[PDB]
Subunit: 309 residues, 4 copies
């Protein structure tokens, strides 16, 4: 039975995101095996060696340049392989995603898909459609990183550990996402309550703070050329919640079955995740304004999915 | 300047609590040195050896049987071993007994030149936190009690178990004086940001009387554990190690602690349990949760009963 | 397949060792479930609650007062339940051990046994005999703690992190165990080499240091009444080596199949351990003096086993 | 005194190495503050934001685009971005180029009042470690180079893979000047205390030529990784974070580092790779492994070639 006490991850895409993700899993000692799949075979071999060079300072792992067929007995397939009209972007990514998901399913893979490729909510739905897997075993990173960025920006404004800050970005990851100010809090004190006790914090600083979250990727790409440490860390956090069976609440792309009056899309909302994937979708009671933001995000996303399929 | 990158903790009290605390600090790699002070010198020497036997499986430390004078260059003095309430002793006698013992600890620690943070877990904690402040002459923000940290953990783990969620995704406080007068802040309690009131609307199989009972079981948790296994220690040891990490890693973490009231909740000149921000300099901000009328009344009744005992004890 | 990503430990014995072990597993986030089995049902219920009170500060776990029947789908059964002539001590512990192992096997348990009850090498062999399990899936703590004590004592003499100190105690845990000075080193510099560079270290300090290791339990019991933090920590280290599939070298009680000229006993030697238990028994080439110490430890232990069975 | 329980690292160089190093420090929770200094100011600002985006999943930090003057109260200055060898540049030109750049880093850092430890990873590391010592005026034991830390990890992981053992149970060194002249200490290399010579006797399917090749692959590892993926960074970033933890947690850990030779191996007045004990005060003890005649010759040839370049560079 202890023959099972070996956690295996297949990573698809060895760009800055996949490579950083593998490094995060090395340093935190999450899983015992990482197979790295990418068209660029030389690069994945180089990365597997560079990452392996770190292992003497952490817990051991088998790290290698892998093939889709190595997903047969994987716990976790992480898809980062995303090509940069919105509908053309989707059609291009659907053909690439089919070339990933089909051979992975053909391997006998029977674990959880974790999708981080842009656009994530659409490609999460597409992964579900192509794979034939249950809804709860296809997960997208959704607004996990936007939420982390939001919490860290509040943490810095108020000089508090972001782990004591509780706020969500929800909807489709992208321009239509929105902040759930109504439930956002610091140690259980709502932002509305916090602003009353600390009125140096102007409404316009909060507006700007959400705008900086929405435009974060643009600002980072402008400064250093790409974004990767954030999403790599989020993917490793989601990976730990699955592999350690945590029943952790994370904001993820999850299948709408009536939540917020939505159906038959993947979109960002807090959910409970454990070894079996999504257990519970948390439906935060939104204000009329927040519910409208959710409906506009959903509707625009549903239109693109319909047109794409 | 890196000569200072050595964190030192002086633990006063080598009971089940102090001992478990030191073990938590060993396994989590918090601090580089633990001096254990107790009247029972052989026991502290035995514990220092037993704890040291663990070190080859974790980060290294100097662990030893210590004296008050070893607090000179300590970052942290952790006070655990409160003289226990005898049958038919008044609360005020319990306090007076603990004040004479506490004076015999705090005075020689201050005399050593100790200039760090006091972390008080001795029962009764809110009163002995105030007493440590009074005896030490230290600033308000450098005398901290464990307060409702454990009651809050117990409350969060109870909600976690009812709802099948990691307690790290559950956010609820017990506040007031640690003891019979403490109360749950249901108004701000939430699971991943969904208030308990909101959660109960979506899941109405959860009856009001299960929630009432759940707070009652938290209030009476120590009595239930003492009845079953004779003593309580893993909970408070873990809480003390969490507070110790928040200080020593300068986290600005929000934790429910005994902190000095300067108008918060309409209270003054007591230590009592409420969320606060804590870093390397101790208490940075006291969070004043806007309480319902019922929750504010519970806070006032806890505070007033505690203030009466302190007043009577100092005179 | 991710239905398997749930590690379960059944602990037998909720005395200071078992209870400290469970606490170590809580603080280090090892396994997702601990069942605590003991005659004293009230005490195990109290301990499961006290340990659960810690969980909000660490990774989640299911911790409960358990029955032998709960071992059915356990990864790991840890036996600490040991009653304090040597042959009478063994006969008393064999009847108690039979009352543990039989109902655990009857449950359908199909994991690894980790034995810490005194006397450990004898009860490790007895666990193998009673269980019918393969040799490599019955492991004793053996000289893991004596070895830790030895390394920490060298660490303190020389002011070096014990993790940079490499020395073994081997043989039967107890009076006949011996230090392997021939291979003992600090950062790869043998103790013989270290003493040449640092001749303030007298041979008689080294003799005393092994004597203090052999008598460590006596000295600690005299001072504080019992010994538990050491073995609790060692048991949690061995548990991590199994559950994270490390192929770690640890000094353990393992089955002699010709190593050191020994057969058909469990005795202390370094071994490789992973998710499947013992993979490789390291046979350290001993000096004539060290080999004699091993043979005398083995022979006295083999006589007691023969007489007991 | 707890005002000091704030560990600060100034990183010089925000290339793949510096950036990966800062990420390793974020994920492992080492230090409370990282200032990133590089000529490319936009890149450091972008990195500080990207790294900060990770913080809600780990322990908190202040991460920012920094200047040399921010080293004033730093514990640790980590120097990574060495000007790379151009095709047909001499070794001595590489050194002279790096000395002018290194002077422009070390002088303003010393001028800030910085009084911590220098940790040098810039190529060529043993030479720039000596140069940092010469430019800074700091004591020998407070200027440390990464030396053969990564070569040693690569060597241990290669043995781990041959034998199917956790590399943490494998104990082998590469020593000398990091680069083509470095050598394996086979004589003291072991797996759980069993020397490689002993292991090969018990497992004679392991051929001498596989061991020769295994050291050759370690020596040429960087060339092989650069050929395959264009650059090397996870290895050295992880090593730098391990050395950083040994200093900041005062571990007295044995690591293979660039340390000042004062008679060890018959060497004087160079930095070169050998195991040493390191704590909060830097280098405490240099371990002198008794080398075979062949291993000692390799050490002498590595040292002498390195000493010639240093002599020529300083004059």
């Amino acid at each position: 039975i202890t023959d099972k006490d070996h956690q295996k991850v297949i990573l698809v895409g060895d760009g800055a995101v996949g490579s950083s993700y593998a490094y995060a899993m090395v340093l935190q000692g999450i899983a015992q095996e990482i197979g790295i799949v990418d068209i660029f075979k030389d690069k994945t071999k180089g990365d597997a060696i560079d990452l392996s060079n770190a292992l003497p300072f952490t817990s051991p792992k088998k790290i290698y340049s892998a093939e889709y067929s190595d997903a047969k007995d994987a716990d976790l397939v992480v898809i980062t392989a995303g090509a940069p009209t919105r509908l053309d972007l989707v059609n291009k990514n659907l053909k690439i995603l089919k070339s990933i998901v089909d051979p992975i399913v053909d391997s006998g893979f029977n674990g959880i898909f974790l999708v981080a490729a842009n656009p994530v909510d659409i490609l999460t739905y597409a992964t579900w459609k192509l794979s034939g897997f249950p809804k709860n075993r296809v997960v997208g990173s959704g607004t996990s990183l936007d939420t982390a960025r939001f919490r860290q920006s509040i943490a810095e404004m108020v000089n508090v550990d972001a782990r004591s800050v509780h706020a969500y970005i929800m909807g489709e990851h992208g321009d239509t996402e929105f902040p759930v100010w109504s439930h956002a809090n610091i140690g259980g004190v709502t932002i509305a309550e916090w602003v009353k006790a600390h009125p140096e914090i102007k409404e316009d600083k909060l507006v700007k703070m959400f705008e900086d979250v929405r435009d974060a990727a643009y600002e980072i790409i402008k400064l250093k050329g790409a974004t990767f440490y954030g999403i790599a860390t989020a993917l490793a956090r989601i990976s730990k919640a699955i592999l350690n069976d945590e029943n952790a609440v994370l904001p993820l792309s999850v299948y709408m079955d009536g939540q917020y009056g939505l159906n038959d899309i993947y979109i960002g909302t807090p959910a409970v995740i454990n070894r079996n994937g999504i257990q519970n979708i948390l439906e935060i009671p939104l204000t009329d304004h927040e519910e409208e933001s959710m409906q506009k995000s959903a509707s625009q996303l549903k239109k693109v999915l319909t047109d794409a399929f």
